[PDB]
Amino acid sequence: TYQYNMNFEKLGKCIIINNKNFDKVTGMGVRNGTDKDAEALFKCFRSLGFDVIVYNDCSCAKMQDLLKKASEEDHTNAACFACILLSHGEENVIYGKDGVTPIKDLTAHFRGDRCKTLLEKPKLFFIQACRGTELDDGIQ
Amino acid sequence: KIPVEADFLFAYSTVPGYYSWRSPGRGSWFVQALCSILEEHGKDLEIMQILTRVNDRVARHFESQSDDPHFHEKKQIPCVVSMLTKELYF
């Protein structure tokens, strides 16, 4: 009674956005190693039971359309939704192939009033990106 | 009636204001750890137990290797943001 209901026909959809290459105009360099990440994530989340789809080097338009389209799907027989974002980023924003888009713009499609079929179901967002330019020197 | 901003969870690879680290040869620290934990305990632990164990792994088992004395021997701690109203098991 204190756990999310999992008795559904499928665990849910999982969208992986894998941004490796960026337009010169962004001045962002190649994210070498992210291909290793995306396939690893692919193996793990399909193992959990997600029906996972990978997209590469998405534009901001592409990223917005992807999650919006997903939010307009029928999640009646899904237990949850998950989205993994692999890209460059700064505070509150994430880099697309052609520029930046705020993360809250991307996840707002899955708000309770905009995605009824995912209501009272967990919406998971995993984000691999910078959130600023401070460094953690650590200590022992 | 329930809040529209409810039942979200944000697993950030790092805290606000801070850099996120990646190894060109093995991948980003966060995703490496995340996948490692999810392979072992993905089906027998609650999601917050999993992410807590991810936080621990990134903090301890990673240290930046860099040319630049400004970017060398640096650390990272991920950042979990939960708006969940129940426990999550896969």
């Binding site: 070498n32 691999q128 | 680290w21 190894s23 060109p24």
Partner: peptide, 4 residues
Amino acid sequence: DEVX
């Protein structure tokens, strides 16, 4: 090692 590179940053994001």
